[PDB]
Nucleic acid binder design. Structure first.
Ligand SMILES: [Ca+2]
Ligand SMILES: [Ca+2]
Ligand SMILES: [Ca+2]
Ligand SMILES: [Ca+2]
Lengths: 269, 269, 269, 269
DNA sequence: TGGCCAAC
DNA sequence: TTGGCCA
DNA sequence: TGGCC
DNA sequence: GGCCA
DNA sequence: TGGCCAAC
DNA sequence: TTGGCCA
DNA sequence: TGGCC
DNA sequence: GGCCA
């Protein structure tokens, strides 16, 4: 086994992330009933609410699905974060789970600060035709001080929880409608060559703000382009009208390479 | 990626047991210092005090290294037990962790009531020369009620924390010496053929019970055989004089199959 | 507002014990349903199974109702134990909660090893007619190392969860009936004069031990006397047929001093 | 005892709040060493950081000093919040602990949204000479659904953690300096007549933004005016240069009415 | 109640 | 290892 | 203390 | 939640 | 090892 | 109630 | 998909 | 994180 992720094959590393996301999708799924009641029937306080409501729900849902805590903390801008040990066949890996909640009226892509970017981005602006850039503001790991030695790198695992919804303003006791909770597992920096080797191959899009062409502040991530590069990295728990809880569907791919989506079992929580 | 353990290949099942052990071994290691202090300096009361010190030190070391808790509890003679979700590449598997603490003066073998026996056992009693047979008393899985369908089987994982020590003529604040902590990982039933195909092929042995006095019968497991059966299923956190913590050693079985050992990193806790 | 319990008036000390009991009573109440299910339907193994079911059900009910944890653990024959901070008007007091579980067939009195005895006891053995004397085996407080000075005494609070039941001829999935749960709050030493000033004035009595066979000696406490000594120190969660939960009753002693009982509210858990 | 705060005398209610704050001051004090290292040596990310860093530290400090959790949650704008049972001599009270972190360059007063206002405010604008108003956006309680009945009111307890600091921009590995962590316990709505009976008696000040005279959006709270109306409601843990941790000082008043400040004991945490 | 004996 | 059962 | 940006 | 009156 | 007897 | 001690 | 407010 | 091209 290994204690240093850097001693892991890109594939093995990928499983850590895959492994981390599946757990997270269980927590959300099992929190869906309540997630929806809170998201929809919480006060209005003049817009902005949803921003909070998202991070709030994402935490009330994941804090109960955690693992072996590590005695190290850090303040950052990512609405949710826990340093911990993550049991794995590749070895008990020290990990830093970073996850940010988002609320949007859109169902494809979402914006992010340099401080949320797992890897160095580089895409090509449609109109412009020129290359845009953004260094990653998120570290690859957080060195931990061994007791029997020195620093041990706790890997950084990035996850995004997008709450796609629609305004309704306010009916009886409902002010809006949660439609689906999308979940994304953004690949680690070490995996750059795979998901973003050059500007003509990448799930990153044009920022949303004044500047365009060359280096930029903001950026985007398009769900479709990510899924196509790897199906399990785009999870989606959708609310039909048959269940109070979302539709427990998990996207992956069989051992023939065909992307498949299966329905899993969840508990009352 | 599998929720039902039965859908797992045999090697994989092994894998969740091994990642389960590695996590417990770590939890113990990071507590071995306090473990020593509590085990050697705790005042003996009506003797048999080694009993409860083993149970207690075990709970404390592990209760801090748990994972995604599932809302189901047990009530039995098992020392430490928790139902929960165990994340892993093979899927987020529901699991009943069963750890039994043992205060022992012998660094070889270990005793088991039948309710602690994972698989159906069969061995050849040397003294008598015959053949002994014990039926596993531990359920393969505990069924959970699915919030959205059938029942979900919770794998049963058996671990044994064996505290090797020796009494001592009180000197300092010490009353006895904790030589080392052995952590055993007994294989789940589905593995029966790989570890106990026939009577002569097993790691079991005569039980510490007295048939003459007509006692119900128990069975034993012998570290040496167990280790040969599978290196990682027998771990030993040995206390030395270099540090106050057990020496951080973990044995695995080389990429090619030969037994190997390594020193690992651990945090102060 | 006081950190050292010794600086507390006698009435106040009582107060932290009573608020400690009320919290445990609630924790139990909200678990009485599962408590019943586990206690009556759990398959008997080598009998004496009522023992571990009492311990287990107790831990589960209370382990969920704790407070500000302090970084210090015990190792002894006490069933449930946690060092911690207990908030209150009288100050944030450090405290060693000591709860012992008992599986009993009698709704009167309760047995105590000496290591469970809070104060020095003295009573008048009726059969012999003489006078019996037992020295408390429970420390008044556990000293903690101050990060900024001296040591800080952690009050010792003794609670007893007594499970009253009767065996039964297996019928449904039932093997025995849990009639009710009695929760006792024994007073801390500093209260000795108020509860056991002289031998004839006490709530103790002969111990369940056999002196003839030369057994070490234990002592008993008799609910009836205890209750008269102080109403709230004896609580009873009785199981009825109206609901699956114990009937939510809590007895206190009226503003003027007369005993009073009330039905309280509890959550589903 | 009582389960409904509304059955409590304003004084008793005040003790709940007093009791809640003292615990919180212990958590912060015991987190001071780390609180400071994080606050000061965390990245710059171009201002705003401190805003986050404050709530972050306030949570890493308090989440470990919690009590008996209640199975109810709610998303709001207050950076920290937990519904729970709070042991008290007045009875086990269901409580909703609301606490907001703030970071400021000032050491007196701090701004707040209607959504952070515990009680209806009303002061008199200096210049203007006219009365200003603001309804309280924070509810007095959150009804909980009894299992054996109906709604049970979980009291709302408001607390403010102001991290007074000073910019330094960036030296070696320090970018700013935390000087003191002030803590405030804002009185419940039921206590309005006491701390704010009319506009000429109140710790509230003029908002900070365009509008002035008559009803307003924002508002202020001046530490001095609050302390003078009640000494324990203004706690301050200050960093001198003798200790890594703040100066463990608690402000209260003896049972002669003289405000006194004492030094308490804290653990390593 | 008090105490013996029991299978833990 | 704490507890039933007996007088 | 105020309200401004 | 800065800066300045 | 295997098994008895022990004080839990 | 699980474990020491003995051959 | 882009950048605008 | 809205709105619109
Ligand atoms: Ca966000
Ligand atoms: Ca055991
Ligand atoms: Ca007990
Ligand atoms: Ca704030």
């Amino acid at each position: 086994m290994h204690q240093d992720y850097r001693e892991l094959s890109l594939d093995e590393l990928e499983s850590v992330e895959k492994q981390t996301l599946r757990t997270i999708v269980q927590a959300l799924q099992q929190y869906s009933k309540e997630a929806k009641s809170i998201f929809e029937t919480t006060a209005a306080d003049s817009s902005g609410e949803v921003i909070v409501l998202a991070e709030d729900i994402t935490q009330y849902a994941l804090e109960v699905a955690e693992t072996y805590p590590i005695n190290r903390r850090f303040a950052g801008f990512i609405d949710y974060k826990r340093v911990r040990w993550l049991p794995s066949p590749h070895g008990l890996l020290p990990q830093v789970l970073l996850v940010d909640a988002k609320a949007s009226t859109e169902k494809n892509r979402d914006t992010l600060q340099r401080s949320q970017l797992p890897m160095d981005a580089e895409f090509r602006n449609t109109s412009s035709g020129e290359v845009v850039t953004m260094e990653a503001g998120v570290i690859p790991h957080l060195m931990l001080q061994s007791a029997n030695d020195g620093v041990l790198p706790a890997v950084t695992t990035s996850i995004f929880v997008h709450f796609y919804y629609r305004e309704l303003k306010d009916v009886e006791g409902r002010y809006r409608e949660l439609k689906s909770i999308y979940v994304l597992s953004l690949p680690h920096a070490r995996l750059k060559q795979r998901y973003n080797p050059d500007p003509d191959t990448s799930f990153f899009g044009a920022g949303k703000h004044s500047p365009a062409r060359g280096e930029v502040a903001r950026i985007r991530v398009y769900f479709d382009r990510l899924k196509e590069a790897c199906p399990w990295r785009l999870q989606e728990l959708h609310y039909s009208a048959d269940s109070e809880y979302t539709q427990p569907r998990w996207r992956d791919l069989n051992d023939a390479g065909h992307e498949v989506t299966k329905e899993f079992l969840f508990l009352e929580r």
